[PDB]
Design a protein around this ligand. Structure first.
Ligand SMILES: Nc1ncnc2c1ncn2[C@@H]1O[C@H](COP(=O)(O)OP(=O)(O)O)[C@@H](O)[C@H]1O
Ligand SMILES: [Mg+2]
Ligand SMILES: [Mg+2]
Ligand SMILES: [Mg+2]
Ligand SMILES: [Mg+2]
Ligand code: NA
Length: 464
């Protein structure tokens, strides 16, 4: 599989025993405690890291945005590195004089009414009609939470309805299509800031997904979506999967973790979320055969196979997926508490456990404690994750960005997705090197050049 993509994750943040601590100040401490090993991004803390990622305060939250990658396995890897970066940043923040003790959560709600975002970004061709993107992604986004959901205790935006639901974010979305990300949240966000030539490219800005801990969930989330987008772009999909009341269906699907809720399609068909997902899987399979046949790459085949297998197991018995899906693993933990301690779904302790699942600390987060016991299926190994904290992917412009920050960090004034700004001794003016093509500036393009250059001056000279 090959499509430029990236994940932004806004982290939940709290300062224990300082319950009214200013969240912007706490977020700033986190980012500023990690900033010694990045460069300012082009008045809150906002930096680029040597792995090509952005780390910044997005109003009330610290946010980590992966470098651009080309496939869902690398998306998992550099997104997981972001969890390690957040944990280390909070650890370092506490070591600084007057530093606060700050807890961070890779989730989407504080269970107190606030909701924050885990955004997926997908490079698309400008020539794809946005109406087609909307028509074909709304039913997919409504139903993919049967394997993408992270689980949530509490029903409704204020979390006071009693029960468990598939997704953290479903209750906070109110419209089908629109521009905002924090109010009147739209299933299809229309932000158009491509960080590339807008005549050729669109960055599809997806805001509906829960942050996932499980690598299988993040992999399926990004991979299945990317396959659906390939069908949209070519014009492959003939069927109209439109659902009658998309916002209502998003919530109803989430509120039924038995996976029996039947959606009403515009054509009167009644399908479960799993069944509509199966119709997307079967279309994906016909599309890959028609465009690739037996020449399908191994990662595309793996995503197709895992997507199909997961849907069959969800239909048979979702609990056999506890090593794979966040909502299933979390539900398993929660049902254990309900059995051991005779707790109803409204018990406050279950909302604490819900949040603990997402704690970035290796010994305190419940997902991390499952991984420590080898109880979750993983796609990458920890050695690779640690490397990915500091080194970029080799096959996007993040390579050029991250390696320049590592090797020429003394001469970088700022950087962003679309440029690196150099300060050369003896040159009066700052030197802006644009990086407009997401697939230029790879190790194949510039690895040897960067190896050879001993200074930013030699690099900048070579590029003009
Ligand atoms: N042209 C593109 N196509 C797809 N992903 C992109 C593109 N440019 C940047 N990205 C990815 O988009 C995300 C941008 O993060 P951020 O700056 O937080 O975006 P936002 O403008 O939504 O806040 C990153 O994960 C980055 O890798
Ligand atoms: Mg962002
Ligand atoms: Mg944000
Ligand atoms: Mg975003
Ligand atoms: Mg932006
Ligand atoms: Na936002």
């Amino acid at each position: 599989m090959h499509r430029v993509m990236g994940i932004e994750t806004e982290y939940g943040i709290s300062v224990p025993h300082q319950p009214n601590a200013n969240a912007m100040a706490a977020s700033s401490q986190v980012v500023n405690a990690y900033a010694p090993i990045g460069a300012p991004a082009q008045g809150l803390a906002n930096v680029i890291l040597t792995n090509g990622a952005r780390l910044y305060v997005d109003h009330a939250h610290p946010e980590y945005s992966t470098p651009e990658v080309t496939n869902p396995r690398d998306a998992v890897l550099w997104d997981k590195a972001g969890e390690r970066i957040m944990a280390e940043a909070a650890r370092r923040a506490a070591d600084l004089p007057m530093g606060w003790t700050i807890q961070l959560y890779k989730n989407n709600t504080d269970n107190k009414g606030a909701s924050y975002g885990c955004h997926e970004n997908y490079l698309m061709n400008r020539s794809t009609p946005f109406a087609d993107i909307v028509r074909h992604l709304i039913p997919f986004f409504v139903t993919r939470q049967v394997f993408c959901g992270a689980g949530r205790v509490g029903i409704g935006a204020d979390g006071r309805g009693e029960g468990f639901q598939l997704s953290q974010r479903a209750d906070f979305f109110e419209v089908e299509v629109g521009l905002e990300t924090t109010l009147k949240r739209p299933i299809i966000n229309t932000r158009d800031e491509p960080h590339a030539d807008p005549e050729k490219y669109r960055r599809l800005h997806v805001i509906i997904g829960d942050a996932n801990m499980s690598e299988i969930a993040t992999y399926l989330k990004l991979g299945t979506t990317a396959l659906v987008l390939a069908m949209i772009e070519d014009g492959f999909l003939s069927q109209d999967f439109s659902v009658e009341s998309p916002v209502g269906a998003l919530r109803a699907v989430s509120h039924d973790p038995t996976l029996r809720y039947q959606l009403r399609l515009h054509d009167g068909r009644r399908l479960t979320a799993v069944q509509l997902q199966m119709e997307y899987l079967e279309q994906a399979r016909k599309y890959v055969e028609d465009r690739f046949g037996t020449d399908v790459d191994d990662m595309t085949r793996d995503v197709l196979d895992r997507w199909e297998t997961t849907l069959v197991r969800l239909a048979d018995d979702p609990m056999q997926l506890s090593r794979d899906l966040d909502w299933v693993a979390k539900l398993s933990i929660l049902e254990g508490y309900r059995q051991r301690e005779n707790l109803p779904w409204s018990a406050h302790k279950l909302q604490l456990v819900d949040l603990q699942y997402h704690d970035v600390r290796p010994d305190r987060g419940l997902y991390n404690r499952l991984v420590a016991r080898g109880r979750m299926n993983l796609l990458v190994d920890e050695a690779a994750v640690r490397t990915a904290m500091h080194e970029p992917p080799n096959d996007t412009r993040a390579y050029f960005r991250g390696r320049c920050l590592a090797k020429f960090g003394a001469e970088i004034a700022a950087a962003s997705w679309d440029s690196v700004i150099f300060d050369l001794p003896g040159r009066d003016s700052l030197q802006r090197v644009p990086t407009l093509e997401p697939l230029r500036g790879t190790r194949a393009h510039v690895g040897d050049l960067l190896d050879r250059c001993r200074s930013a001056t030699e690099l900048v000279a070579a590029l003009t």
